[model samples]
Target chain A: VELRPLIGLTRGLPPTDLETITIDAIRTHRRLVEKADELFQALPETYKTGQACGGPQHIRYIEASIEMHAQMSALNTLYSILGFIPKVVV
Target chain B: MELEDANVTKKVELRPLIGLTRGLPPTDLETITIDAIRTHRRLVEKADELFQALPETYKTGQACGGPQHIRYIEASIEMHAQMSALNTLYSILGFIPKV
Candidate 1:
């Protein structure tokens, strides 16, 4: 089956009140949550750990961090749909 | 020297973020896989241990209650993140075909 890849990229960080110390962390957390939501909706039942599930619910925080880092890097290079801001001021 | 004389010094270095898109080395993949395996095992064992620690009254197999449910929810978020990381790494390594 050709499973359609869900692109769950999210832009912007959470509210300033959220304890986001770094830009990378903020971006990653957003992406991770977005991806997790996508997976949750896609496969709610079989989405347990170590079950060979698909989507973003498998990796946790670090995955989100890595993805956000890559995404932000791409954005800086003008290679992504999201535009780069110097900082998202709280 | 009766009483000390002191000096303070500071140094700073600035380096640009470089090589962000560099492809992963073969060894990097091995490292990532091993790390993921270890992390997964640790999370599972920890969850099992927590469940075992609960009193008999709280050990009911039905829906977890009150603070127990909250703890479960937090753990679920953590485990979800772990699962996402593992999948992302696998996809990057071409182990599981990226959707």
Candidate 2:
């Protein structure tokens, strides 16, 4: 939920190594988002009203989506850090 | 880089050890150990790769979030804390987690 400790882990290394790990995080989160995509589609319209499932089974599509969202933000940070994505102009 | 990462990627190394003694889980120990070993190694690999590259800013904790600077740093820091728990978890169970 917080960001300081996230960055603090690598707070002691050289830039070369930082790049490698940051990219790794991006790749990890990317897969997480992709997996959530499948869960998102399986949900019925009614499920959208609440976190509960509209389908016969109590699927966790909604919950997965929320997790994916956080992953997305985290991944974006990784991407921008690695220069995989451009940072916004000041 | 492989051996280097193994040596230096770095987790607190104590948290997992602590977690292993909690004795609170209903899940399968074998599966849990196997899975933990698998993931712990996997995560260390990635985290280590990046850890190998840390520049002064990261080391100093001065990296402000840019498009990615601050955010990536934030994410990586979080990994250390979580990994510490995992690291401790693997250890207190009696198995020595070698990188």
Candidate 3:
């Protein structure tokens, strides 16, 4: 894939009540990525290189993270979508 | 947000929380599967190999890590294209990750 620029989806618009809630959710959701990065740093480079943990083990670790961060990002997108729509009581 | 509504095809465009500028070799998200975990497994292993070669401060996230971080995140983000697809696939498949 060709490399492009980051979207940098930071907080730009003001948050409504539901969006406020979702943004809070985004806050928590972000931790998953943050923690994943944290763990990657904590883990030995061997896990990355598969020099220590078997290739399978290291791949598993990264896969779990890939799953995790992707999941969180998806949630944030959903709530952010809700943010885009007009707020209504359900 | 909703997986079906995601309409995601490319990797970076797979999800909207943040566009990381990378994806699965232009692979679309629709082709990803739970049964093919073994296949996905091999891809990430290769991604890990690339990830390891990243600069030490790559984890610092944009800005702090400088251009090296940008390079690392771009690569990291590309591998994550599968992750985005897998997350949606798992949700539909009703499987928990590593659980």
Interface DockQ of candidate 2? 0.08
Q: Note each model's CA RMSD in angstroms.
A: 21.6, 11.7, 18.7
lDDT of 1 by residue, A1-90 (tens): 001111111122232211222344356456665874665455445443333432333334323334444333333322222233436543
Report every candidate's CA lDDT.
0.39, 0.46, 0.43
True contacts kept of each: 0.00, 0.10, 0.04
Tens-place lDDT per residue, model 2, A1-90, is 223344434445466555666565566566777776777566566544443422222224423433444445455455544556433322
What value does the lDDT take at residue A30 in candidate 3? 61
The two-chain DockQ for each candidate, comma-separated, is 0.03, 0.08, 0.04
Writing each residue's lDDT as its tens digit, candidate 1 over B31-75 gives 544566577667667656666666665456433344453343234
Cα lDDT tens digits, model 3, B10-85, are 3333343122212322122222343235555766676577557665544333323333433443344434544555
TM-score of 1: 0.38
lDDT of 2 by residue, B1-99 (tens): 011122233333442233222443323333443444565466556666664566667545765333345344544444544445444444444444333
Residue B39 in model 3: lDDT: 52
CA shift at B83, candidate 3, in angstroms?
A: 9.8
